[PDB]
Amino acid sequence: AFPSTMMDEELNLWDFLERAAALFGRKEVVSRLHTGEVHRTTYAEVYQRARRLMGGLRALGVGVGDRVATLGFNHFRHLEAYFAVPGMGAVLHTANPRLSPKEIAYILNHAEDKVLLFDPNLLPLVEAIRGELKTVQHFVVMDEKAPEGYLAYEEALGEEADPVRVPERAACGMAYTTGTTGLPKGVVYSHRALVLHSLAASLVDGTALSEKDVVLPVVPMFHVNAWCLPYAATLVGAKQVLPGPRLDPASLVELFDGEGVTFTAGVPTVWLALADYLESTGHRLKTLRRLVVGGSAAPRSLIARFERMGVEVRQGYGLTETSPVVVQNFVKSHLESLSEEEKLTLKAKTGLPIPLVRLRVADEEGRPVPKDGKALGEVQLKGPWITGGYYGNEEATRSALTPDGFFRTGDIAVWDEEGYVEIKDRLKDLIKSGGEWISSVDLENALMGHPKVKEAAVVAIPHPKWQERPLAVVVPRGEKPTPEELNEHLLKAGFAKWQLPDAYVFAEEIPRTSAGKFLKRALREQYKNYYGG
Amino acid sequence: NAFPSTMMDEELNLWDFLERAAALFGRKEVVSRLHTGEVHRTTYAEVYQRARRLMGGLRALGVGVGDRVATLGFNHFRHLEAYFAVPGMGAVLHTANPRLSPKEIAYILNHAEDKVLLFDPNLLPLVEAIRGELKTVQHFVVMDEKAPEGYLAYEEALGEEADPVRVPERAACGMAYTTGTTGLPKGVVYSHRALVLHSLAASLVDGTALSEKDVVLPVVPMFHVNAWCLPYAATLVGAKQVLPGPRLDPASLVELFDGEGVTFTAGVPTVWLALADYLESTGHRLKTLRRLVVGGSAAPRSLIARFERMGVEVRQGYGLTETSPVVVQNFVKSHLESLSEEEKLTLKAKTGLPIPLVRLRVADEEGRPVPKDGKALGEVQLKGPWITGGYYGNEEATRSALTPDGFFRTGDIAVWDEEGYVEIKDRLKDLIKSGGEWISSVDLENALMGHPKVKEAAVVAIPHRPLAVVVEKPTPEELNEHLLKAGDAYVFAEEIPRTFLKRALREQYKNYYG
Numbered sequence A: 001a002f003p004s005t006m007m008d009e010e011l012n013l014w015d016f017l018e019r020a021a022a023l024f025g026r027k028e029v030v031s032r033l034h035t036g037e038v039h040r041t042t043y044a045e046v047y048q049r050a051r052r053l054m055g056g057l058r059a060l061g062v063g064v065g066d067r068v069a070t071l072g073f074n075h076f077r078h079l080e081a082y083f084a085v086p087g088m089g090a091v092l093h094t095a096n097p098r099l100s101p102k103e104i105a106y107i108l109n110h111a112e113d114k115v116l117l118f119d120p121n122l123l124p125l126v127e128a129i130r131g132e133l134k135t136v137q138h139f140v141v142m143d144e145k146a147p148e149g150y151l152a153y154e155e156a157l158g159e160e161a162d163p164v165r166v167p168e169r170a171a172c173g174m175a176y177t178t179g180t181t182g183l184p185k186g187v188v189y190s191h192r193a194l195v196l197h198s199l200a201a202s203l204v205d206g207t208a209l210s211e212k213d214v215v216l217p218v219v220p221m222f223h224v225n226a227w228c229l230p231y232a233a234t235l236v237g238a239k240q241v242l243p244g245p246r247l248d249p250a251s252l253v254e255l256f257d258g259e260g261v262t263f264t265a266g267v268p269t270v271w272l273a274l275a276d277y278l279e280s281t282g283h284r285l286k287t288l289r290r291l292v293v294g295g296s297a298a299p300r301s302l303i304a305r306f307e308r309m310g311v312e313v314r315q316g317y318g319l320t321e322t323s324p325v326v327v328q329n330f331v332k333s334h335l336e337s338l339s340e341e342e343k344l345t346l347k348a349k350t351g352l353p354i355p356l357v358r359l360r361v362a363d364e365e366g367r368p369v370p371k372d373g374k375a376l377g378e379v380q381l382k383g384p385w386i387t388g389g390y391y392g393n394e395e396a397t398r399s400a401l402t403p404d405g406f407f408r409t410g411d412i413a414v415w416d417e418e419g420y421v422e423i424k425d426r427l428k429d430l431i432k433s434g435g436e437w438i439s440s441v442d443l444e445n446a447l448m449g450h451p452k453v454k455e456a457a458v459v460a461i462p463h464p465k466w467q468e469r470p471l472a473v474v475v476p477r478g479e480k481p482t483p484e485e486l487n488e489h490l491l492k493a494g495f496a497k498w499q500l501p502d503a504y505v506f507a508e509e510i511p512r513t514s515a516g517k518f519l520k521r522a523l524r525e526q527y528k529n530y531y532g533g
Numbered sequence B: 001n002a003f004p005s006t007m008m009d010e011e012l013n014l015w016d017f018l019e020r021a022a023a024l025f026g027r028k029e030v031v032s033r034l035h036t037g038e039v040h041r042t043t044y045a046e047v048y049q050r051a052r053r054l055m056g057g058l059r060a061l062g063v064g065v066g067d068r069v070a071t072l073g074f075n076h077f078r079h080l081e082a083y084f085a086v087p088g089m090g091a092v093l094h095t096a097n098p099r100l101s102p103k104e105i106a107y108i109l110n111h112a113e114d115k116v117l118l119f120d121p122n123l124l125p126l127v128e129a130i131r132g133e134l135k136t137v138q139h140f141v142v143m144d145e146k147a148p149e150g151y152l153a154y155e156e157a158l159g160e161e162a163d164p165v166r167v168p169e170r171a172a173c174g175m176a177y178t179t180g181t182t183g184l185p186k187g188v189v190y191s192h193r194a195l196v197l198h199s200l201a202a203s204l205v206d207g208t209a210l211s212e213k214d215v216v217l218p219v220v221p222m223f224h225v226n227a228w229c230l231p232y233a234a235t236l237v238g239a240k241q242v243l244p245g246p247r248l249d250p251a252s253l254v255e256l257f258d259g260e261g262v263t264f265t266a267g268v269p270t271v272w273l274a275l276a277d278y279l280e281s282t283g284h285r286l287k288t289l290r291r292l293v294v295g296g297s298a299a300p301r302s303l304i305a306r307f308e309r310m311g312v313e314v315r316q317g318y319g320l321t322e323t324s325p326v327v328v329q330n331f332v333k334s335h336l337e338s339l340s341e342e343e344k345l346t347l348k349a350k351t352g353l354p355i356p357l358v359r360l361r362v363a364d365e366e367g368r369p370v371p372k373d374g375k376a377l378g379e380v381q382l383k384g385p386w387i388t389g390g391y392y393g394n395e396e397a398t399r400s401a402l403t404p405d406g407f408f409r410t411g412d413i414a415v416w417d418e419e420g421y422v423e424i425k426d427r428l429k430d431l432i433k434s435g436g437e438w439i440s441s442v443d444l445e446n447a448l449m450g451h452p453k454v455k456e457a458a459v460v461a462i463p464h465r466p467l468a469v470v471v472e473k474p475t476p477e478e479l480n481e482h483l484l485k486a487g488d489a490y491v492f493a494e495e496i497p498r499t500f501l502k503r504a505l506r507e508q509y510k511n512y513y514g
Helices: A014-023 A043-059 A076-087 A101-110 A120-132 A191-201 A225-236 A249-259 A268-281 A300-307 A340-347 A394-398 A440-447 A483-491 A520-526 B015-024 B044-060 B077-088 B102-111 B121-133 B192-202 B230-237 B250-260 B269-282 B301-308 B341-348 B395-399 B441-448 B476-484 B502-508
Strands: A028-032 A038-042 A067-071 A091-094 A115-118 A138-141 A171-176 A186-190 A214-217 A239-242 A263-266 A290-293 A312-317 A358-362 A377-382 A407-415 A421-423 A430-433 A436-439 A453-462 A468-476 A503-506 B029-033 B039-043 B068-072 B092-095 B116-119 B139-142 B172-177 B187-191 B215-218 B240-243 B264-267 B291-294 B313-318 B359-363 B378-383 B408-416 B422-427 B457-461 B466-470 B490-492
Touching (some): A014 A076, A014 A191, A076 A091, A076 A115, A076 A225, A076 A239, A101 A120, A186 A191, A191 A225, A225 A239, A225 A263, A268 A290, A300 A312, A300 A340, A430 A453, A483 A503, B015 B044, B015 B192, B029 B250, B068 B077, B068 B121, B077 B116, B077 B172, B077 B230, B192 B230, B215 B250, B240 B250, B359 B408, B422 B441, B441 B457
Parallel strands (some): A067 A115, A115 A138, A468 A503, B029 B240, B068 B116, B092 B172, B291 B313
Antiparallel strands (some): A377 A407, B029 B039, B172 B187, B359 B378, B378 B408, B457 B466
């Protein structure tokens, strides 16, 4: 084309910490260690110590492109590693301390980590797998002291070293998938990818990170770089409060109120426990204003419970795979007029694609499905931080993209005209019938509309030909209806024959749960072989 | 060797902003007041569809990847469509300033070798006058529904919708020339990468804080620093846009402000001063306006205070010139919120803090950082994705653009403090080197113009020693004490050459001191 006159420059994570040290040097980074003690530092200090970490790692043989692993929780040393490793051209491999010892050994050997930084309380685990590690040459405890055969982080620190800039497309970190395909798959992130993601996700309609914020990352830093919060927070100069491993309600409330946290991000389970605690104690968080929930789709009630306490809730979706965060939820300006119930349903949706992300919900052909909020399709993506394959795994890589270059998430969902995407629980709700998908929730909600039906629970049942087929357990409203009546009632609802339940069983009651929700778990086992599958 | 990542190969591209806008915020409005004063209304969805047709039409006119297409117009929907169509098809958008002399316009249009020119109807007289001097323009398109003989109407130039043509992100998407610089105009060529990154970095909370719920009114011309990337950024977030056209008088703006519910706006000091005078004398207030950004001339302390007194948060920005784009934005640090009104006001009056992705330093002729005491003078030098590394077709200008270590030399003098705040002062040349010491003429003249007996004052360096040209006349002693209470020879005149044309003054009093 026509050449620009823009200077040749590369994006680099290290720049965030350098900028932070110069403009927000005194902003604090508070951490609660595993012992429960609270440590206090600042960006200026973290910057100086990180420069020393690069020197120390170099003294230990770490060079451009080498992998350095961590097995720890959110605290200042992990933050220093977050910058030191990428800053020296190395690759930060963050490993989940909650994985089995065998899987940890597997990913550490697959990534061929040369050095391992881990928390003191994980020594027993490390000591147990040490003999199975083929490449780790140095074990560094993230503490002041370390046992025999181990090196202490504070002693490993060396002379301050200048950063070593690498092409932005070069790797800065990596993480492996789990519980999905089964076998852990590695995803390698670049500086370009994380710098861009940190910018795109921090806008007003996103996390709205600001220098005045006090950020508390409940999301582990060993997952998808903790939503890039540690990086983004550093970029804007926000104060950071790293909780360490103690994620119990009391411990968090203490940090929330004590430090004046304004923003936080975490998983549904931690938030549910927090909500239960706040409600039963009648205590309220004075400064908390924004809460992001990722991972499991946050239930409608969770959003409502926190919103009722003045806390704005925003969902987010991303995979440990390709992208940390590709969809974030916020209410469009013209949708602010919706009723509390409708707006709640909106907030309960996964969200809208964020800047720099191209997303579509398509079929096996890669063709967009109808934006009616009903048609099922696979979420496919393109963007700066979306992976195009995997590390050391031809098979997984060759079948990762569609002919036109989109990444296949493996997540099923629906999308509407407003652009909102709604990931569907491919297990608790979706029925995989011969390479096709069917929502049991949609079917049952429609059925419960029929006058003769008091309660209906649709579930997936094993099938010989197709993998699974829908089965409806009806609870009659007096005179039990006929399977034909119900079939027409569904046809007049927009459902096609191929998706109609194959059989309708009857009962006087459907097993509920503590929450009074259908205990489909039991139903799936009762009618386990109802279709001879 | 550097470890490969598994991230897919992708490029950043301005067209993505509009496509995303059409898909997620298709109904958000883009309102425009034309030169006639009429108000036109459209939406991103429509702008997207028409932009695709503009790419088809331009292609039909021979425009290809890398070719330059120029505009001579103000802020309105057609200029917005061009903002996306040209870059979207791989071409280069050359935005020319309609207020420049006919000669300079023909020069930059000939230097950029523009192949097509899009211009506003009310500029036909100007274009018709220079048409014969243009060696490369093959098609003259009037941005209106109809056009005179020899000219093509924009609405007729539109053809079949065409798909965008993506180019490497480092490829050119637009260009603009410098001006006023004693020498030949210098061309700066921007890339998709540069503008996309800049739109993200400047729109954060501590920046413009652009949101889909905002109603943005770009008073900054789209022919200057891409109107602060506002047209691009506003599109990205899906914000409603209100393009004011040429009529920037107070009444006209207030009408759009109130009538459209504008929440954010950006412009130059003169437009804002006129606006402040109007609002204060009439007693009228703007109900929805919440944030105002002022760029270009450093905004005076009173300007910020007057708007702040009216509930409007003011934020300065530095980079209303091609060579030094928006690289510094002002905002009050959280721990500095405790300052007194006066101190905080003085803080807001400072140019600001360097924005994300920008590496900035105030250094000496050796490229060494000067003391962060808010007193030591040095030149602002920069590095970043949207910082130019040279110029188009001008070896001399390009060879001396960077420091040995790769920083761009802005030519702007300033001081900076421990908090990171940069304070743009005098301009390199206009500086006064008096015996191994430095003196800012800008500081001196700004202080002098504060004295009641001084209407206008211009301080310049004279061979030897600052000289002040003042415009009942005060005594040199009065002014000397007025400066001493603030922290040689005083000439007088009835007017100072404008465009302060200190160039002329330096020569007139060339040997006033010997």
